[PDB]
Amino acid sequence: MAKLDELKQKLTAKQIQAAYLLVENELMEEKRTQDEMANELGINRTTLWEWRTKNQDFIAFKSEVADSFLAEKREQVYSKLMQLILGPQPSVKAMQLYMQRFGLLTDKKVIEGDL
Amino acid sequence: AKLDELKQKLTAKQIQAAYLLVENELMESEEKRTQDEMANELGINRTTLWEWRTKNQDFIAFKSEVADSFLAEKREQVYSKLMQLILGPQPSVKAMQLYMQRFGLLTDKKVIEG
Amino acid sequence: MAKLDELKQKLTAKQIQAAYLLVENELMEEKRTQDEMANELGINRTTLWEWRTKNQDFIAFKSEVADSFLAEKREQVYSKLMQLILGPQPSVKAMQLYMQRFGLLTDKKVIEGD
Amino acid sequence: MMAKLDELKQKLTAKQIQAAYLLVENELMEEEKRTQDEMANELGINRTTLWEWRTKNQDFIAFKSEVADSFLAEKREQVYSKLMQLILGPQPSVKAMQLYMQRFGLLTDKKVIEGDL
Amino acid sequence: KLTAKQIQAAYLLVENELMEEEKRTQDEMANELGINRTTLWEWRTKNQDFIAFKSEVADSFLAEKREQVYSKLMQLILGPQPSVKAMQLYMQRFGLLTDKKVIEGDL
Amino acid sequence: LTAKQIQAAYLLVENELMEEEKRTQDEMANELGINRTTLWEWRTKNQDFIAFKSEVADSFLAEKREQVYSKLMQLILGPQPSVKAMQLYMQRFGLLTDKKVIEGDL
Amino acid sequence: KLDELKQKLTAKQIQAAYLLVENELMKRTQDEMANELGINRTTLWEWRTKNQDFIAFKSEVADSFLAEKREQVYSKLMQLILGPQPSVKAMQLYMQRFGLLTDKKVIEGD
Amino acid sequence: MAKLDELKQKLTAKQIQAAYLLVENELMESEEKRTQDEMANELGINRTTLWEWRTKNQDFIAFKSEVADSFLAEKREQVYSKLMQLILGPQPSVKAMQLYMQRFGLLTDKKVIEGDL
Amino acid sequence: KLTAKQIQAAYLLVENELKRTQDEMANELGINRTTLWEWRFIAFKSEVADSFLAEKREQVYSKLMQLILGPQPSVKAMQLYMQRFGLLTDKKVIEGDLG
Amino acid sequence: KLDELKQKLTAKQIQAAYLLVENELMKRTQDEMANELGINRTTLWEWRTKNQDFIAFKSEVADSFLAEKREQVYSKLMQLILGPQPSVKAMQLYMQRFGLLTDKKVIEGD
Amino acid sequence: LTAKQIQAAYLLVENELMEEEKRTQDEMANELGINRTTLWEWRTKNQDFIAFKSEVADSFLAEKREQVYSKLMQLILGPQPSVKAMQLYMQRFGLLTDKKVIEGDL
Amino acid sequence: KLTAKQIQAAYLLVENELKRTQDEMANELGINRTTLWEWRFIAFKSEVADSFLAEKREQVYSKLMQLILGPQPSVKAMQLYMQRFGLLTDKKVIEGDLG
Amino acid sequence: MMAKLDELKQKLTAKQIQAAYLLVENELMEEEKRTQDEMANELGINRTTLWEWRTKNQDFIAFKSEVADSFLAEKREQVYSKLMQLILGPQPSVKAMQLYMQRFGLLTDKKVIEGDL
Amino acid sequence: MAKLDELKQKLTAKQIQAAYLLVENELMESEEKRTQDEMANELGINRTTLWEWRTKNQDFIAFKSEVADSFLAEKREQVYSKLMQLILGPQPSVKAMQLYMQRFGLLTDKKVIEGDL
Amino acid sequence: AKLDELKQKLTAKQIQAAYLLVENELMESEEKRTQDEMANELGINRTTLWEWRTKNQDFIAFKSEVADSFLAEKREQVYSKLMQLILGPQPSVKAMQLYMQRFGLLTDKKVIEG
Amino acid sequence: KLTAKQIQAAYLLVENELMEEEKRTQDEMANELGINRTTLWEWRTKNQDFIAFKSEVADSFLAEKREQVYSKLMQLILGPQPSVKAMQLYMQRFGLLTDKKVIEGDL
Amino acid sequence: MAKLDELKQKLTAKQIQAAYLLVENELMEEKRTQDEMANELGINRTTLWEWRTKNQDFIAFKSEVADSFLAEKREQVYSKLMQLILGPQPSVKAMQLYMQRFGLLTDKKVIEGDL
Amino acid sequence: MAKLDELKQKLTAKQIQAAYLLVENELMEEKRTQDEMANELGINRTTLWEWRTKNQDFIAFKSEVADSFLAEKREQVYSKLMQLILGPQPSVKAMQLYMQRFGLLTDKKVIEGD
């Protein structure tokens, strides 16, 4: 909310709507086409193209919204992780991730020499 | 400790709700209930649970800590699978590495010149 | 915006146009040929060649434009990451990237020696 | 580990300590493991009580995790036995040899550092 | 510094490898340059200024390929078989991945 | 630790790291002249016993060194020379060096 | 290095550590080695399991025997590089032996 | 220039010629490479003297290694050409993409550090 | 420092790996079989061994380039080539504190 | 084919086989499917485990649903062939679909 | 087979092929109302019981068909389309043909 | 045999995989959503599907040759090429008897 | 299998039949398996007798192998259970799917044969 | 010759030209391939008519497939060149050696048969 | 049956010798005796056993059948390892295939046109 | 049958790929043959006799490589990393490997 | 002995000796060089080269002797096979070979059509 | 000997010599160049080329000579086979080849259908 708020103010209401539509199309539970999204927004195809390619504030805000949508999925990822570990066919790689999540693994170094 | 700070902002009911939602969602994607089937046990309206889940920032933060707690509690079950891979008919060297790293048993030596 | 405008200063209007066209051809929607892009720009084929091979300011700017187009794909990449996690063969490597994205993974490092 | 288990013990009842050991033993000690209900019965507690301890009591969870670490630690020679079987067997593992050599800090990488800061 | 001909030779050798039939042979490049094969050989094997300049030119031609590389990276991510390694490269490009370390001990 | 506990730690480690069928916990308990429940108590609740037994395990593993080295050399010199085994050999004697360039500001 | 550890062993224990290492690094069973040393098998077993100075000395002589193999390892390395299937991993090791590879780091932050 | 000339000063004209001939035999494109005897004959020296320079003369060895480095360095655009072919070909190589990106320092790893060394 | 025959003797043996068996080598040196076992010292001979490996540099480089330019270009060989010339950068951004 | 097996089932059993297959080939639990069919869970279980005609009919409708997916499979096949990583194994299948590959045998003996 | 033996065969197969923790042999014996030794005797010495139980196992496996087909289609249509799964699909419907040329004398 | 619109309707749908969703397709056809489910018939439409795949032959061959001639020549693609033209022989010598 | 075991039974004593079952049970029925001496003792026979039967009596060996086949055959649903777990689990095995489909003869390869003889 | 001409008889001059153009676009070496619209324009036909020939005209489809076969067949020496490069290159391909040997029928499998079919 | 034909050509002692030699040589290449240590138990001279092993064609043929018999007798031990691979924490699909082939449970269907 | 020029063209095209700088281009081969590029294109795309002859020539050049292939096979078997697959190919070449079958049933 | 005897008679005593020496050098428990073997046989290097390259009877007899030496090693192979199966780390591929040795595996085909 | 003599009939003495030389260069002890082999044979480089590319009788004979040289390597191949079987990483694929060499492996084949 710290970054979204500063960026939001450099964008129009339609641009904000556009950023959310593009992200929802990819990260919210068949995808819409670019033409379908421009239509829904009531803008021309060329306008959407301009925002996506030339408007740095639009791009930056859209990346922040994307991060927010990705963040919400954490328990979904956790569920899959535990599924790979706790079934009758355990994944050692998944166990590595579990252990790292809780900082359980140690790497030890003995250093000699001079600088 | 973080759970305690986030717990004082919530009612007993919201707290029970958070625990029940986490258990349900961390289940494999067989016995898992729906959101309406997660209003009956708690004895609340479906819009209330939806408002807690989506619009209540204190509820959302606590529920995240509760999810971490859920995974943390499974430690001995994880360790059991690790040992099974080590002791099975195709012993996993990767599982052995992880065992050894758990107890800080592996050393890398480095000699540095300036 | 700052780095692009800085690099943009050293270029002509046509060169800036050329940089965008070359990048759009690769990162949006090769498909057009070098000749077709030169024709579109209303410049000689030999001029586009000289810009691409001999103009360090052009090359640097175009590379920054390439970075911008790549950055804008973020949610599309995230969507594929989640599909691999949630699909019929859940990808642990994708899960690792997800967890690293939010700084969820920690190792202890023990350092000995003088 | 003596002092750490003692510190985490202070906040739990005798029944809660027994429960933590039973749960870990079920997973980490040598036809089928016990169910939650079977263990609840063994402890003489209600199933809802065992769930509450496993779910909501952070002191119970933290103690039980320390118990888990202890059970895992005690397997060391069993892990070493498999390590040696992979090294010496008819499909000898160079990865297992690397682990053996790292265990005793026998492997060195040398570095010549240059630059500034 | 280098002669104009030597600078031209460096560009032609790099163009032969990194731009755009078959590639030109060494003999064909010497002829296009209007120099002896022995002269081209001498520059390539004994002239350190020429070698160093040509390497810098090679770096520049490679740098200019950036969007073509990115295009293939995106195709690997989005194609029928999405590549997780390509996803890792994408996320590293923008510094999106963190590892946390808790450091203990002495030096 | 008592003499019996030191003996028990050695027997448990010998069972795993010397050898061909290994003894059961019950057989090891009998051999020591203790009850199965005492052995189980030592292995699960006695932190001094666990700590000591782990150090004995380390000693038994350490003693295998020449046998590990033998297999390492067999992989190097065998019909299918192992480059990974060569890497371990060269690291063992600090024979491998990289140059590190570092720039700049922390 | 060896001469400090040597002091803590009997002459027969020194002989045993050398025989154990030679058996591995230059085919005999434990019984055959004990019979060769003129000691009982339970004695060899006690040295191998309970004598920390014996174990430590033996590991040291193991290192010495291993070090002596260096040219044999080099021969195999060069065979993998110059053979009918040149090995890139072997080339990497060669290059590292002579400190020919640079890993370059750019560091930024607090 | 400087390092080569420093090493070059310690060798005879014939030794310098020999070092280039040996490196050219390996690293310049020409049906079969020349044999040792063929190179000695071309140099107008004994088989035995070439062997001596190659094995006992540390200055010769050092100069020849520097010459080999220069020959390898000169191949840069040829290596880059293959890197791009792997990236752009019908089986695009993500590993080659990684190398490309490493070449220009485009890949960042972020570290968050805590503790006390 | 060493005698002339010892210097010749070192160069000759390392040549063997970098053929003649142990006793064959012992017979060439004019020493006993047992004496060879006793020595197996690790100083000059080892430097000649390193020197022997060092001298093969252009031959190693030739194989590297063949792997890069062959019909199946090796990306790992390209990696080593670039590392040889310090062309690959890894960037680290470090945050936090330690005290 | 289906119409012979159909005769050996009740209307509700036909409905159950279709629902079970649709659940898999076009998310519901066993209890939800039984509740949807208006039968008790032990009844669904008995049909699935003890009724051979039910099992046989259900496998047949499973085949029918699977067959209907053919163009979807073709779409994926062509995507793998014409994609940014053309798949040789997918090309092999394409060629085999149209009988384009010859395996040639020379036979000798008694 | 007796009614009890038919019941036992079904229970053993259900334990493995329907499901979540499975019953022990002792629990299955109790459920059937027979001694552990009787169950063991049937599983090891009764060839009619073994033969019948194998046919029941086949029936339980056969009944899984739509679930196997579901996973097959998921691998085909998923984010990582499986060409091997496509091959199985095409073979299922006899869609793949090779030409065989054969020459000559046996 | 089929009506003209049914022939047009078959060609149109197979085109979809070889975009428009199920209901989108149902709306184009001017039929109900339920009716589409009932049909999902497997005769002419299936032949057009096979016909659609059949027609891409030169595009498949182009990818085959690219794999063979690319910077990482595919031996498996070479195998398929040779099989296409019946160039690979497997020889069997058979002994024994059966009666 | 009834008649085959009956035929192989005719040449063995009751003790030899018991011995064959004990040996197979030791390997194929669900902390450590019995040693040869422990089984010899159980049977009330000398260790040399058990070795002689296992080594030299072809009728004993042949019967015991038939018993082995029977024990293995009876595991069928346990094998099927693992097959289904590999198909349906989070790392779904296309190879396991092929085995499932072969089990019921669901996979067809078509051939068009040409030539002569 | 014969099969091509039999299929060719069913097509117009323009359709024959179209079939060759489509195959040449895919299987003959020339920066970017031509688009469908580019080919229709080159042929002097509607976009819609090219589409019709490609999708509804079975005679066109069949002829074009035969033309594609002929174009692929003509590449033989180019394929053989790559096969030899894999065999002779710095990483010799045993699989390519197998193909070479299969090409000339050099590999035998011996079978000894018994029973009664 | 072949053992019986080859057995009638040999003495009791030669027969015992064949069984003992096979057991010894089929051991892992720990408790294995030498040829001289395989003359004592049998109570014969070392040259006699060497003559049987190398020069006696009837002894050689019988010993080969005895080696086959030795491997044959290990069937249930082989089956045990097979089941362990199937039931372990990384179930082996290849082991499942072999199980199924043992009992002729896998069918390939072929449709042939003339 | 073919003209002398067509036979010459078939050999040159095969020689360019399978014997022995860069390979010749199509334009360079047309010039060496003294024919139009369009003529070479016509023979390669439309002349079935020419295509069939060239393929037979290609088979002959490939057949002639036998000892070079065998040399690499032996190097794989005997080299520092002996290849078991190459050993299998060697043994199949001489018909050294047998599989036994006990056939049951009906057809 | 059926084939060795017919072939042996087309060879000289020295040729027979040569065939056995070449095979022993490879299959009998550091190998001799070609020059060392020619010396031991008391023949010239060129003579040994002639026999190995031009004498078809010599080559055929040597291959038969090689088969005989290889055959003798069967129990050595059996020992390794059982080592791969019966250890704490079983090989499924080795189990396949064991089962095939005893003809325990069935491949089943259902054939339809016409010819 | 029969096939070689038959093929040898169609060739000159020099051509036969050339065939052996080409094969010896690859299969014994390339190392000599095409020019060096032509010089050794006392023929023009263009003559060796013509034989290699245009003489079907030469090509066929040389291929038979190649087969003969390869056949003679038998014990060398057998030695490597045994080294893989008996080395530190016993090769099961090598064991399979060994067993197939002596026809030791059998499968049952069951055939149904009309």
Q: How many CB atoms lie within 10 A of CB H33?
A: 12
Cis peptide before K104 (omega within 30 of 0): yes
CA distance A85 to A93: 9
Beta bridge mates, B107: A108
- Domain coordinates of chain D in residue numbers? 1-106
Task: Give the integer Cα–Cα distance in Å for A22 and H73.
Answer: 47
- The token duo for R74 is 């038998």
Name residue C25's amino acid: N
Compute the CA torsion angle J45, J50, J56, J62 (nearest 10 deg).
20
DSSP state of C17: H
What CA–CA distances, in Å, run from J34 to J17, J24, J42, R83? Answer: 11, 15, 9, 64
Amino acid present at P14:
V
- Which one, of N72, O16, R92, lies nearest residue Q100 by Cα? R92
Written as six digits, the tokens of O73 are 């007798």
Cα distance between residue F73 and residue A1, in whole Å: 61
Query: Hey, which residues does O108 pair with through a beta bridge?
Result: Q109
Identify the chains in contact with I, defined as 3+ C-beta pairs within 8 A.
Answer: F, G, H, L, N
Tell me which amino acid residue M87 is.
Answer: I
DSSP symbol at L91: E
| Pairs of CB atoms within 8 A across O/R | 3
Neighbours of D20 (CB within 10 A): 25
* Distance in angstroms (rounded) separating the CA atoms of residues P99 and R100: 6
Give, to the nearest 10 degrees, the angle between helix I75-84 and helix H76-88. Answer: 140
Look at chain D and count its residues. 117
CA dihedral angle for residue R73, residue R76, residue R82, residue R88, rounded to 10 degrees: -130
Task: Provide the strand spans (E) within chain D.
Answer: 108-115
How many other β-carbons are positioned within 10 Å of the β-carbon of residue I72? 15
Quickly list H helices, K1-106: 3-17, 25-32, 36-45, 47-62, 65-77, 83-92
CB within 8 Å: N26 and L51: no
Contact present, R88 and F75 (Cβ < 8 Å)? yes
DSSP state, residue B37: G
CATH topology of domain A1-104: Arc Repressor Mutant, subunit A (1.10.10)
Residue E80 contacts K, CB cutoff 8 Å? yes
| Nearest C-alpha neighbor of D71 from the set B73, B83, B105 | B83
Q: Say which residues have a Cβ less than 8 Å from residue L47's Cβ, sequence separation at least 6.
A: none
Task: Please list the residues that pair with L90 across neighbouring strands.
Answer: J105
The answer to whether O97 contacts M99, with C-beta atoms less than 8 Å apart, is yes
Number of helices (H), then strands (E), belonging to chain C: the values are 7, 1
Q: Tokens at residue A86, please?
A: 């706790």
- Answer whether M93 touches K (CB < 8 Å): no
Q: How far apart are CA N22 and CA N8, in angstroms?
A: 15
Closest C-alpha to I74, from A104, O83, Q81, N91 = N91
Q: Which helix (H) or strand (E) is O111 found in, with range?
A: strand O107-113
Which residues have CB under 8 Å from K96's CB, separation 6+? J93, J96, J97, K87, K90, M109, M110
Cα O55 to chain centroid, rounded: 22
Q: Which two tokens stand for residue A24?
A: 């929802």
d(CA Q16, CA Q57): 10
Which candidate, J65, O87, L50, places its Cα nearest to that of B84? O87
Q: CB under 8 Å to Q86, separation ≥6 — which residues?
A: O74, O77, O78, O81
Q: Say whether residue B98 is in contact with chain D using an 8 A CB cutoff.
A: no
- Please tell me whether residue P51 adopts helix, strand or coil conformation: helix
Distance CA H105, CA P24 (A): 40
**O42 CB-near residues (< 8 Å, 6+ apart):** O13, O16, O17, O20, O49
CA C24 to chain centre: 11
Backbone angles phi, psi at D110, to 5 degrees: -95, 145
- Map residue G102 onto helix, strand or coil: strand
- Whether the CB-CB separation of P45 and P14 falls below 8 Å is answered with no
- Final resolution, Å: 1.9
| Count of C-beta atoms within a 10 Å radius of residue H116 | 11
Place of tokens 């655009």: H77
Domain E1-96 has CATH 1.10.10.60: yes
Distances in whole angstroms, Cα of residue R96 to Cα of each of A97, L93, P103, R93: 40, 19, 21, 5
Whole-angstrom Cα Rg for chain I: 22
Q: Letter for the amino acid at E58?
A: A
Q: Any idea what DSSP says for residue O76?
A: H
Chain K contact probe: residue of E76, E77, E81 with most K CBs at under 10 A: E81
Question: Which phi-psi region, left, alpha or beta, contains residue F94 (left: φ > 0; alpha: ψ -120 to 50)?
Answer: left
Q: Which DSSP letter does residue M16 get? A: H
Fill in the DSSP letter of residue P19.
-
Which residue bears the tokens 């819409």? A32
Superfamily of domain B1-106: Homeodomain-like (1.10.10.60)
Which residue in this structure is represented by tokens 């943390």?
B72
Give the CB-side neighbour count of residue J62, counting CA atoms within 13 A.
27
Tokens of residue J31, six digits:
């209890």
Q: Nearest chain E Cα to P27, which residue? A: E21
Nearest by Cα to H70 from H32, H24, H29, H15 = H24
Q: Tell whether Q91 lies on the interface with D, counting CB pairs under 8 A.
A: yes
Instruction: Round to whole Å and give the CA distance between O17 and O10.
Output: 10
Q: If we measure between CA atoms, which residue out of O36, O107, O22, O112 comes closest to residue O65?
A: O22
Provide the Cα torsion R69, R75, R76, R82; round to 10°: 150
R83 Cα distance to chain centroid: 23
- Left if phi > 0, otherwise alpha if psi is -120 to 50, otherwise beta: which for Q113? left
DSSP chain F: --HHHHHHHHHHHHHHH---PPPPHHHHHHHHT--HHHHHHHHHH-HHHHHHHHHHHHHHHHTTHHHHHHHHHHHHHSSS--HHHHHHHHHHTT--EEEEEEE---
Count the Cβ atoms, other than its own, within 10 Å of residue O34.
10
Residue type, E30: A
CA of C42: how far to CAs of C51, O29, P31, in Å? 14, 81, 36
Tell me which residue of D103, D107, D105, D108 sits closest to D84, measured CA to CA.
D103
3-state DSSP assignment of residue P99: strand
Cβ–Cβ pairs < 8 A, chains O and Q: 96
Which of I46, N31, H93 lies closest to C31, judged by CA? Answer: N31
Contact K52, K6 (CB under 8 A): yes
The answer to whether residues K57 and K13 touch, using CB atoms and an 8 Å cutoff, is yes
Task: For chain P, say whether G82 makes contact (Cβ under 8 Å).
Answer: no
Which helix (H) or strand (E) element contains residue G106?
Answer: strand G102-109
C-alpha distance across the termini of chain L, in Å: 52
String of b and e for C94-103 (b: at least 16 CB within 10 Å)? Answer: bbbbbbbbee
Percent helix, strand and coil across chain B, each rounded to 5? 65, 5, 30
Per the CB < 8 A criterion, the answer to whether E18 and E62 are in contact is yes
Q: Which of M72, M38, M45, M41 is nearest to M60 (CA)?
A: M45
Residue found by looking up tokens 């001694």 in the block: K35
Chain-chain contact of E75 with H92 (C-beta, under 8 angstroms): yes
Bridge partners of R106, per DSSP, are: P100
Q: Tokens at residue R99, please?
A: 């067993």
Beta bridge partners of Q65: none
Query: CA-CA distances (angstroms) from residue E74 to E68, E69, E89, N84?
Result: 10, 9, 10, 34
Domain J1-100, second-level architecture: Orthogonal Bundle (1.10)
Give the alpha-carbon dihedral of J96, J99, J105, J110, to 10 degrees: 110
How many angstroms separate the CA of residue N36 from the nearest CA in chain P? 21
Closest chain C residue by Cα to residue K72: C88
Phi, psi (rounded to 5 degrees) for J97: -50, -35
Task: Check CB contact of O93 with chain Q, cutoff 8 Å.
Answer: no
Method: X-ray
Structure tokens belonging to residue Q56: 């078809």
> What's the burial of L93, exposed, middle or buried (CB within 10 Å: 0-12/13-18/19+)?
middle
Type and span of the H or E element at B7: helix B2-7
Classify domain L1-87 at the CATH topology level. Answer: Arc Repressor Mutant, subunit A (1.10.10)
If one counts every other C-beta atom within 10 angstroms of the C-beta of residue P12, the result is 18
L93 touches chain K (CB under 8 A): no
What tokens appear for A35 in the block? 């033409």
**DSSP label of K48:** H
Nearest Cα neighbor of K62 from M103, O96, M79 is M103
End-to-end CA distance of chain M: 40
Q: Compute how many other C-beta atoms are within 10 angstroms of the C-beta atom of residue C55.
A: 17
The stretches of I1-99 forming alpha helices (DSSP H) are 4-15, 22-29, 33-39, 44-55, 57-69, 75-84
Q: Give how far the C-alpha of residue C63 lies from the chain's centroid of Cα atoms, to the nearest Å.
A: 7
Question: For residue H91, what are its two tokens?
Answer: 């089986």
Token duo for residue C35: 């000749």
N117 touches chain R (CB under 8 A): yes
Instruction: Judge whether P53 and R62 are in contact, CB under 8 Å.
Output: no
The answer to whether D108 contacts B106, with C-beta atoms less than 8 Å apart, is: no
Which CATH number is associated with domain F1-95? 1.10.10.60
What's the rounded Cα separation, in Å, for the pair N37 and C39?
19
Angle at the Cα of Q18 (from Q16 to Q24), degrees rounded to 5? 105
Which subunits have 3 or more CB–CB pairs within 8 Å of chain D?
A: A, B, F, G, K, Q, R
Cα–Cα distance between L49 and L61 in angstroms, integer? 19
Q: Are strands O107-113 and K97-103 parallel, antiparallel or unpaired?
A: unpaired
Q: CB-side exposure of A61: number of CA atoms within 13 Å?
A: 25
Query: Which helix (H) or strand (E) element contains residue B39?
Result: none
State the pairing for strand pair E98-105/C106-112: parallel
